[PDB]
Each structure stands twice: as C-alpha cells, then as structure tokens.
Subunit: 137 residues, 3 copies
C-alpha cells in the first residue's frame, strides 16, 4: 500500500485569517502517485482548523461574524489564568472541527463543484503546521 | 489494497430534510468486498452534510430547532449579495460537519447500538451528491 | 495491507466527564505494527464524543461552560417524550463531532505539540465504547 506525508507551515500576517490550500493539497495528491485512496488534511494546533467552505466573499465574512457570535473573544475565559487570552480560538477550533478527509478518485482530489479547502487561522502570527496524510493505491 | 467508490444523489422534496442512508452505505460496503477498512461518507456540497444521529423523532425535531437557533435563516447575511439567501445552510454545514468516517470490521459497517447515518439536506430541491469512499482489505 | 481494531470501554463515575485516552490510542498504534497510516478514534454513541483538545485546566472548564451555553440541558426537549432527558448530550455530540482521524508517521501517532485525545462523556455512568480503527502499512 502507498502512503505519503507532507506538512504545510503557516505564519499568518493576522491573528485570524482564511488561507486557500486546495492547490497545496492537490500538489500533495499528485506527488503521492495514489490512484484511489483517502486524504486527511488536519491542523496540528488547537487554535486553527482545516475546513471546507466555498470561495464567496460574503460567506467568508458571515463565518467570521458567526464564529465571533458563537465563540466570542472574551477577557474572562478561565484559560486566561495562564495569561493567554486566545480562549475563543480554541472554541472556534472545536466549532469548526480541526480536520477534513477527502477521497482520491482516478488520481484526483474528489471535490464537489464549489468545495475549497482552507486553513482557518484563529490565533496566527506564528509558525503552525497542517498535516496531509495520504494512503491508498 | 482494495478501494471502492460510489456516489449517492439526492433531490429532496423540501429545502431541509433528514434522509436515512445507512442501508445505502451498507450496500456499498458489501459491494466493496472489503473485510477490514475505513468508509468515508461525505457531502459534496456546502449546504448539506452527512451526520450520524439516532432515529428518535423528538430528537430529529430538537436538532432542527437547535440548528435554526444556532444558525438561523437570515435575510441580511452578506452572502445575499449574490441574491442567494441560503447563508444559514452553509453555517449549518459548518456546524454539523460535512462528513463521517466509519470502520469496517469483519465485512461490516462498525456501528454503535443506536447510530444511524443521515444525509442532512439544508438547501435541497435540486440534485446534490454524497460520496462513499472505501479503502482497506 | 494492515488493519487493527480495538474497542475502549468507559463507565464514567459522572454524567459528564473528560477522559484522557491518548496513551490508549498510542498503545493501539504500537500493537498494530503500522508504520504509515490512518487512525480513526470514534465514539460509538450519540451522547459522547472523541475530541482533540489540549490539557489546560481553565480551557477544560471553558468548554463545559460553552457547551452548556450552546447546548444547554433543558427539561422541554422533544426527545423527552421518551422520558429521556439527555437531549443536551446529543446536541453536544453534534457540536463537538463524534470522532477524529489521526496520521501514523514512522510508527507513531502524528500529534501536534499540545494535542491530546479525550473521550468526552456527556451522559455517562454506563458502559459505552470508543472504536479505534487503524489501516496502513
């Protein structure tokens, strides 16, 4: 059986940011030479997630507003006992889920007509990685 | 290694609907002849998800009410700049997560005593697909 | 191809509880002899989930408070028609997502610097299982 691993590193210019990584993942799928298989794309951190959204602008704005609404920055989270006040970023990671698993069909990332893979940074400005793990034939 | 792919197509009679697809997935697991492996079941759209719930009626009603409560239809989402006002469906997809991964054990879908796989449509009435991707031996 | 299955059983002392199972999963990864692969860790129940959080105390308290806030116990959920009033536990399962999929790299669980796998019980005090399903080489 074939297996392929690749790590993507980000250091966003902002604390919160949406980064397209579909082509990155597609590059990995090609390198893996896998014809049929599974492709896991997961954030290795608790304050960021790999999500599948689409490209529309307005929707990107809606998700930040919904995230802030459901998992708002707060000064009083208990996590702040450590002096860290990125508690909301952890909640946003829980909310959105840290990862996605995609099919590989006929040597291709099996995506829907509008699906796009993003690295959703919730506490960036420092080096953080995303793992791509592919298995199959 | 063995790999099997199958797409399920839905065109719900309603914008929002709960559709049982466990037997569909089980049919695919049988066709794949896989003894031991993994089975990914994922929506190929941003406005629908594959979820695992159970069969109880009341709970089905609770999830729609909770979804509407956490990701309410709204006329003012920015996504509406496109004239599309299914923004809430995208949020519901984020909320519930687009997919599930299930074990295949001894040639069988490895499910809990009450687990049932559903295709949860949040903006239906048009052709949308779900991918089943199986790998293993 | 190699495949390995192991079930973890819990019967929490409390209705709601956070249980570390990272070492349990690591034990399974070792037993599987898999060098490169995927490792699914999923709750077999609708009222509990496998989540990835980190170890900080304050954050553990924040997640219970956020969960209760987003998916509060309630006496009036429709699910209660059955006399069961664990409706909130089902919602919490939806919220947090029942499972996680982890990479196996060089015979090791491929985890981030702070990632820890937990069994998050939302209606415990009875025997419930978590499945570990590993495939790869």
């Amino acid at each position: 059986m074939k297996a392929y691993t690749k790590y993507l590193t980000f250091n966003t210019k902002k604390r919160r940011e949406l980064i397209r990584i579909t082509d990155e993942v597609k590059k990995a799928v090609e390198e893996s030479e896998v014809k049929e298989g599974l492709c896991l794309v997961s954030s290795m951190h608790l304050t960021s997630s790999v999500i599948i959204q689409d490209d529309e602008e307005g929707l990107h704005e809606d998700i930040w507003e919904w995230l802030e609404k459901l998992a708002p920055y707060r000064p009083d989270y208990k996590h702040h006992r450590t002096g860290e006040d990125n508690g909301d970023a952890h909640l946003k990671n829980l909310l959105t889920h840290l990862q996605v698993v995609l099919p590989i069909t006929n040597g291709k990332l099996d995506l829907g007509p509008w699906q796009e893979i993003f690295y959703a940074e919730f506490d960036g400005q420092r080096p953080k990685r995303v793992v791509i793990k592919i298995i199959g034939e």
